[PDB]
Amino acid sequence: SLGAKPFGEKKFIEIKGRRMAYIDEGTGDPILFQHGNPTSSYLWRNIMPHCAGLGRLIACDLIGMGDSDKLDPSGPERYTYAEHRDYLDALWEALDLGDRVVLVVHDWGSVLGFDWARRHRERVQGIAYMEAVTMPLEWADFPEQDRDLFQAFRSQAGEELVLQDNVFVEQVLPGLILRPLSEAEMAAYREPFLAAGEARRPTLSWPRQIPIAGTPADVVAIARDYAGWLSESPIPKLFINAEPGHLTTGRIRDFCRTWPNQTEITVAGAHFIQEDSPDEIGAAIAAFVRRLRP
Ligand SMILES: [Ca+2]
Ligand SMILES: [Cl-]
Ligand SMILES: [Cl-]
């Protein structure tokens, strides 16, 4: 079901001198759920229950997000993909995940998780993904109605929109969820970002890092690398397609549909589909994991 309660108890661990927050419930091989922008582990709260008793259920808050520490001093150069990766790699190392990990990824969680999986392929038992960056993007891949806004994030206007006005949290997030969110749900999403200014920097640095039309070149290269690898990897995959969907449609869906050893289902949703179809998503992931772990 739906519901505004978080899943499990927030745990904390020191990473590179900062505290990062995460959920870690149960025993066995991990099922590792990774949120993107502008969300947190909270995104998965109604999905993780479906995997109860199927393994160790983990959902990390990215640095600067959820209950994880902010990077100080924050600024325009902070919270790049590379910086996020340094923190997340270190947290995942610290968590002692073993060598049969199932990844469940969304949004920037997919860029991070696909890249981690490429680099740690022997440890990856399966990959479930949805509304993901399956390859480097072009503006044509980007949903038409949202192009101007994302272009504005990637311009000098971005600081006013995001740091001052919290547009990613307050506008984009509900705008890409089909059902109305409750007061408690929006409170949970806005909590890490209540303060104007640098507290909100992750939600601006992220759109500035999207690999689109060749920029930023480093993230483009990372996505090119994992795109080629995923299109050849025999690791089992679960693609949760969405209707109408948002990001993983058109050309980039055409591309991920070429990936080997992949099961697909379609659920209702736009981008943050976890808020629209958590039971269908959870049921599919649980079935995938049961097949991987007989
Ligand atoms: Ca909405
Ligand atoms: Cl084992
Ligand atoms: Cl973004």
XYZ file of C-alpha atoms and ligand atoms in Angstrom:
297
model
C 0.000 0.000 0.000
C 0.531 3.642 0.085
C 1.307 5.581 3.245
C 3.513 8.350 4.543
C 5.444 6.386 7.183
C 9.134 5.755 6.476
C 10.416 2.191 6.229
C 12.560 1.092 9.159
C 14.958 3.055 11.336
C 17.422 5.667 10.091
C 21.051 4.556 10.749
C 24.144 6.765 10.540
C 27.761 6.178 9.606
C 30.778 8.437 9.250
C 32.116 8.616 5.688
C 34.968 10.919 4.649
C 34.398 12.901 7.851
C 30.664 13.349 7.211
C 27.673 11.462 8.563
C 25.560 9.643 6.006
C 22.117 8.244 6.746
C 20.659 4.978 5.499
C 18.102 2.248 6.076
C 19.446 -1.270 6.588
C 16.887 -3.909 7.568
C 17.039 -7.684 7.648
C 19.748 -10.218 6.866
C 21.307 -11.882 3.847
C 22.313 -10.589 0.443
C 21.513 -6.927 -0.080
C 18.718 -5.452 -2.092
C 20.048 -1.956 -2.544
C 17.554 0.805 -3.384
C 18.999 4.074 -4.656
C 17.033 7.329 -4.949
C 18.016 10.316 -7.109
C 17.023 13.982 -7.295
C 15.351 15.570 -5.240
C 14.338 12.570 -3.173
C 15.852 10.319 -0.461
C 15.521 6.776 0.882
C 11.914 7.848 1.664
C 11.092 7.325 -2.054
C 11.217 3.551 -1.496
C 9.222 3.351 1.737
C 6.181 1.583 0.216
C 8.279 -0.600 -2.064
C 10.866 -2.085 0.304
C 8.183 -3.913 2.407
C 7.435 -6.200 -0.575
C 10.980 -7.561 -0.265
C 10.682 -8.483 3.422
C 12.623 -11.691 4.187
C 14.190 -11.789 0.693
C 17.410 -10.164 1.823
C 19.071 -7.254 3.531
C 17.024 -4.189 2.552
C 19.200 -1.092 2.176
C 18.375 2.452 1.077
C 21.025 5.160 1.373
C 20.505 8.918 1.488
C 22.920 10.593 -0.949
C 25.285 13.145 0.543
C 23.482 16.473 1.136
C 20.094 14.707 0.826
C 17.627 13.046 3.191
C 19.237 12.748 6.630
C 22.787 12.770 5.276
C 25.121 15.641 6.163
C 25.454 18.676 3.964
C 28.861 19.329 2.424
C 30.323 22.467 3.931
C 31.372 24.784 2.399
C 28.762 24.268 -0.318
C 28.754 26.142 -3.632
C 28.438 25.849 -7.458
C 31.335 23.357 -7.609
C 29.927 21.008 -4.947
C 27.694 17.927 -5.324
C 28.899 16.950 -8.759
C 28.274 13.358 -9.858
C 31.958 12.573 -9.122
C 31.636 13.901 -5.563
C 28.420 11.972 -4.949
C 30.114 8.849 -6.282
C 33.067 9.254 -3.889
C 30.664 9.339 -0.933
C 28.335 6.620 -2.156
C 31.208 4.259 -3.140
C 32.665 4.714 0.328
C 29.321 4.131 2.051
C 28.641 0.987 0.000
C 32.145 -0.279 0.882
C 31.501 0.454 4.581
C 28.180 -1.448 4.488
C 29.938 -4.767 3.701
C 27.579 -5.716 0.893
C 29.253 -8.964 -0.174
C 29.247 -10.275 -3.733
C 25.556 -10.961 -4.594
C 23.956 -7.523 -4.643
C 20.619 -6.714 -6.269
C 20.457 -3.024 -7.274
C 17.136 -1.156 -7.563
C 17.639 2.276 -9.098
C 15.900 5.476 -10.213
C 16.956 8.834 -11.751
C 20.459 9.785 -10.489
C 20.333 6.551 -8.480
C 20.538 4.833 -11.885
C 23.574 6.818 -13.053
C 25.276 6.007 -9.724
C 24.063 2.390 -9.607
C 24.719 1.527 -13.270
C 28.245 2.983 -12.958
C 28.890 1.130 -9.672
C 27.587 -2.084 -11.233
C 29.893 -1.693 -14.245
C 32.866 -1.252 -11.921
C 31.796 -4.086 -9.549
C 30.166 -6.413 -12.057
C 31.244 -9.650 -10.340
C 29.262 -8.566 -7.242
C 26.001 -7.767 -9.014
C 23.324 -10.443 -9.005
C 20.608 -8.362 -10.665
C 19.618 -4.843 -11.663
C 16.077 -3.448 -11.417
C 15.650 0.037 -12.906
C 12.964 2.556 -13.751
C 12.875 6.131 -15.053
C 16.628 5.856 -15.489
C 19.385 7.469 -17.533
C 20.053 4.482 -19.780
C 22.584 6.299 -22.008
C 23.858 9.832 -22.729
C 20.955 12.127 -23.564
C 20.080 14.700 -26.233
C 17.597 17.508 -25.845
C 15.176 15.547 -28.098
C 15.135 12.768 -25.432
C 14.085 15.299 -22.922
C 10.339 15.628 -22.457
C 9.289 18.682 -24.519
C 7.250 20.471 -21.828
C 10.134 20.341 -19.360
C 12.999 21.303 -21.685
C 12.923 25.024 -20.945
C 12.883 24.490 -17.181
C 15.839 22.082 -17.226
C 17.643 24.413 -19.593
C 17.001 27.198 -17.068
C 18.491 25.059 -14.267
C 21.549 24.743 -16.551
C 21.876 28.526 -16.797
C 22.528 31.413 -14.422
C 18.800 31.374 -13.580
C 19.235 28.074 -11.729
C 20.288 29.588 -8.384
C 17.101 31.691 -8.070
C 14.872 28.852 -9.194
C 16.384 26.234 -6.916
C 18.347 27.760 -4.027
C 15.906 30.626 -3.488
C 12.610 29.107 -4.574
C 13.142 25.330 -4.142
C 11.623 24.642 -7.579
C 12.944 21.077 -7.856
C 11.327 19.985 -4.593
C 8.205 22.115 -4.816
C 7.426 22.111 -8.530
C 9.213 19.351 -10.425
C 8.641 16.607 -7.836
C 4.837 16.892 -7.510
C 4.627 17.829 -11.200
C 5.964 14.398 -12.102
C 3.736 12.344 -9.783
C 0.209 11.532 -11.010
C -1.534 11.236 -7.642
C -1.825 14.086 -5.145
C 0.741 13.881 -2.332
C -0.355 14.238 1.271
C 0.842 16.947 3.648
C 3.046 14.400 5.443
C 4.571 13.114 2.190
C 5.560 16.597 0.984
C 6.876 17.417 4.495
C 9.201 14.415 4.268
C 10.455 15.488 0.834
C 10.939 19.117 1.749
C 12.573 18.471 5.145
C 16.245 18.322 3.960
C 15.576 21.497 1.966
C 13.569 23.720 4.327
C 16.295 26.381 4.387
C 16.901 28.607 1.393
C 20.406 28.697 -0.008
C 23.112 26.068 -0.013
C 20.989 23.447 1.782
C 19.263 23.129 -1.611
C 22.461 22.943 -3.694
C 22.210 19.188 -4.410
C 18.869 19.707 -6.169
C 20.521 22.263 -8.497
C 23.909 20.569 -9.006
C 22.068 17.448 -10.143
C 20.268 18.912 -13.205
C 23.542 20.667 -14.108
C 25.207 17.232 -14.222
C 22.699 15.479 -16.510
C 24.653 14.102 -19.482
C 22.888 16.022 -22.295
C 24.264 17.001 -25.701
C 27.807 16.083 -24.601
C 27.939 18.112 -21.374
C 29.259 17.564 -18.748
C 31.816 15.489 -20.612
C 32.792 13.380 -17.572
C 29.248 12.227 -16.847
C 28.623 11.678 -20.565
C 31.658 9.356 -20.650
C 30.460 7.460 -17.553
C 27.016 6.929 -19.083
C 28.485 5.970 -22.477
C 30.624 3.394 -20.644
C 27.772 1.817 -18.714
C 25.413 2.003 -21.702
C 27.795 -0.128 -23.783
C 28.395 -2.514 -20.896
C 24.686 -2.977 -20.006
C 23.812 -3.663 -23.661
C 26.181 -6.670 -23.506
C 26.003 -7.795 -19.859
C 24.244 -11.099 -19.133
C 23.367 -9.933 -15.593
C 19.586 -10.391 -15.089
C 17.636 -7.145 -15.386
C 14.175 -5.904 -14.530
C 13.006 -2.887 -16.464
C 9.982 -1.215 -14.893
C 8.547 0.847 -17.748
C 6.040 3.601 -16.960
C 2.923 4.958 -18.655
C 3.025 7.783 -19.607
C 6.551 7.725 -18.125
C 8.862 10.680 -18.538
C 12.570 10.094 -18.992
C 12.704 6.428 -20.028
C 10.604 6.725 -23.153
C 11.347 7.149 -26.852
C 14.944 6.612 -27.936
C 16.454 5.872 -24.557
C 13.754 3.237 -23.864
C 14.258 1.846 -27.367
C 17.883 1.464 -26.265
C 17.353 -0.166 -22.865
C 14.878 -2.572 -24.478
C 17.901 -4.020 -26.324
C 19.578 -5.047 -23.047
C 20.044 -8.805 -22.619
C 18.388 -11.057 -20.050
C 15.743 -8.502 -19.186
C 12.188 -8.813 -17.890
C 9.856 -5.851 -18.374
C 6.603 -4.695 -16.840
C 4.694 -1.439 -17.289
C 3.224 0.503 -14.368
C 1.326 3.805 -14.148
C 3.481 6.845 -13.471
C 5.380 9.794 -14.895
C 8.836 10.189 -13.350
C 8.624 9.517 -9.593
C 6.637 6.397 -10.290
C 7.288 5.006 -6.798
C 4.589 7.373 -5.589
C 2.029 6.140 -8.125
C 2.528 2.395 -8.338
C 4.525 1.263 -5.262
C 2.714 -2.081 -4.901
C 3.121 -3.041 -8.568
C 6.763 -2.007 -8.425
C 7.411 -3.812 -5.137
C 5.647 -6.975 -6.328
C 7.759 -7.022 -9.497
C 11.039 -6.509 -7.643
C 10.145 -9.196 -5.096
C 9.323 -11.684 -7.910
C 12.630 -10.803 -9.634
C 14.556 -11.361 -6.413
C 12.769 -14.677 -5.707
C 13.848 -15.893 -9.160
C 17.426 -14.747 -8.503
C 17.462 -16.320 -5.038
C 15.688 -19.735 -5.198
Ca 1.130 15.826 -9.541
Cl 27.110 -15.590 -0.271
Cl 18.118 16.188 -12.083
